[PDB]
Amino acid sequence: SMFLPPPECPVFEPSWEEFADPFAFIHKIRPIAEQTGICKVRPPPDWQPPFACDVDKLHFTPRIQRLNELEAQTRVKRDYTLRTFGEMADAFKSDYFNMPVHMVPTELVEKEFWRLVSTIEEDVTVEYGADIASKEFGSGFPVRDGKIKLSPEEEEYLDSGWNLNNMPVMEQSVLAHITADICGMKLPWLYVGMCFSSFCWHIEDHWSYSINYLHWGEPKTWYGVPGYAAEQLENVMKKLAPELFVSQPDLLHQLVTIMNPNTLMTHEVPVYRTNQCAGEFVITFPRAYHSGFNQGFNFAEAVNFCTVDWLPLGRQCVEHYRLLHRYCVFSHDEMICKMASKADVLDVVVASTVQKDMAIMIEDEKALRETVRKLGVIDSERMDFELLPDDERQCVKCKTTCFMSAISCSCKPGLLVCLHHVKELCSCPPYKYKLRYRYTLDDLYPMMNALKLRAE
Ligand SMILES: CCN(CCN(C)C)C(=O)CNCc1cc(C(N)=O)ccn1
Ligand SMILES: [Mn+2]
Ligand SMILES: [Mn+2]
Ligand SMILES: [Mn+2]
Ligand SMILES: [Zn+2]
Ligand SMILES: [Zn+2]
């Protein structure tokens, strides 16, 4: 056999009552769906957000993609309109199979994708569209304030919990009250697909959820691995493609690849599949590896998503980043402290969950400060870390974005290390160093206490 399709991931068909609140729904399905990494959600049949777009006025520049298994691709890096892209895309698939596009079976495209990527003699290239929601490339969902009168049907979906523009700013999102420069994680991204255009194996930034909606067009085929098996997958991948695991100079140089799910399955990594059709959602859970390809010309929209369930995994993720020397998108501790400073307006369940994470943060910080004092760092000064651009507050050694504290030395102006890397700053003795801290321990306990009062 060439390709043995992985088993199907779970599919949910919520009632209107179940669907109305996405956070409740996603919490409810977690015990099932976290075991598979991905799941598919079919909205109720009358949930039909209208899509409108001028195919001649929307412009984008897609990336050329070689389709070679295990070959390195960079995670981010010729102008088309949506019309001219669609014409290219349709002609490509039509010519590839010598058939009309709807007649090409999904099973065949999948088999052929996996043949094509493993065959060295084949050098098939396609074009992959990825674009932030913006003035120049709008969301597929309705949004306010475009200097345009919206239809009543459009207005029905402005405030939907499953309008991907709203999910990050709803009260149950833990990023709802955050306002650091992290646009990539509260704003949707648009993906214009064609036959075989592919998303390599990856997990989301900070191990966040993702929500993915296929607005229209031909299906999107997915493979997913549960969070629990993330390190098994990485070990399998490292053995077969070690070049992908060399550390990156920055966060725009991440290496990813196409890899046959049968290889993962041969090494006892659990993998699930689905074909996502127009009008369906795919949800990826924290640290759930996923990859896939498009069956044909299509239009998808996705957003990162951080719930109360995610919060403690977010802390683990930043620890894992420190161990790997990987750059952070934002400071998790900064997020926690921001939320604490708004305790009175938080959702009560969010308040309760932030309180728990904050207690861990404070105890770890207490221990770290005791440790650096014993190393002979004596001098200290308060510092408003949040005011520094990220690249001015990264640990020299592990690249973590500092917030709670860091160590500086006047012999190396502007350099910082986190409290795990006091020995990596410079050759001067520790009495010349200064502990730079955002809060005293006595500042922190009342912040956590406000959260407790809000939580009731
Ligand atoms: C939430 C959107 N986002 C942030 C974008 N930035 C990293 C640039 C992602 O990474 C999503 N992960 C990539 C991806 C693509 C696709 C696709 N082309 O259908 C499906 C699943 N995952
Ligand atoms: Mn090939
Ligand atoms: Mn993704
Ligand atoms: Mn001062
Ligand atoms: Zn460090
Ligand atoms: Zn020094």
Author numbering: -1 to 0, 26 to 100, 375 to 753
What does the paper say about this structure?
Members of the KDM5 (also known as JARID1) sub-family are 2-oxoglutarate (2-OG) and Fe2+-dependent oxygenases acting as histone 3 lysine 4 trimethyl (H3K4me3) demethylases, regulating proliferation, stem cell self-renewal, and differentiation. Members of the KDM5 sub-family of JmjC-KDMs are transcriptional co-repressors, which specifically catalyze the removal of all possible methylation states from lysine 4 of histone H3 (H3K4me3/me2/me1), with highest activity found toward H3K4me3. The KDM5 family and domain architecture is conserved from yeast to humans, displaying a similar pattern with a Jumonji N domain (JmjN), a DNA binding ARID domain (AT-rich interactive domain), a catalytic JmjC, a C5HC2 zinc-finger motif located C-terminally to the JmjC, a PLU-1 motif, as well as one to three methyl-lysine or methyl-arginine binding plant homeodomains (PHDs) denoted PHD-1, PHD-2, and PHD-3. KDM5B plays an important role in stem cell biology by blocking differentiation in embryonic and hematopoietic stem cells (Cellot et al., 2013, Dey et al., 2008).
KDOAM-25 was crystallized in a JmjN-JmjC-linked construct of KDM5B (Johansson et al., 2016). The shift of Y425 creates a cavity which is occupied by a water molecule. The propensity for Y425 to adopt this alternative pose in KDM5B may explain why KDOAM-25 is selective for KDM5 enzymes versus other KDMs that either form different H-bonds to the 4-carboxypyridines (KDM2/3/6/7) or have a less mobile homologous tyrosine (KDM4). The amides KDOAM-25, -28, and -29 were synthesized, and KDOAM-25 was shown to be the most potent of the series with a KDM5B half maximal inhibitory concentration (IC50) of 19 nM and improved selectivity over KDM4C. The experiment indicated that the compound acts a partial competitor of the co-substrate 2-OG, with IC50 values increasing from 27 nM at 4 μM 2-OG, up to 558 nM at 300 μM 2-OG. KDOAM-25 was selective for the KDM5 sub-family with no inhibition below 4.8 μM for any of the other 2-OG oxygenases. As control we used a structurally related inactive compound, KDOAM-32, which is unable to coordinate the catalytic iron in the KDM5 active sites. Structure-based design was used to generate KDOAM-25 without the need for the previously reported ester pro-drugs. KDOAM-25 is a highly selective inhibitor of the KDM5 sub-family of histone lysine demethylases with strongest activity found against the catalytic domain of KDM5B.
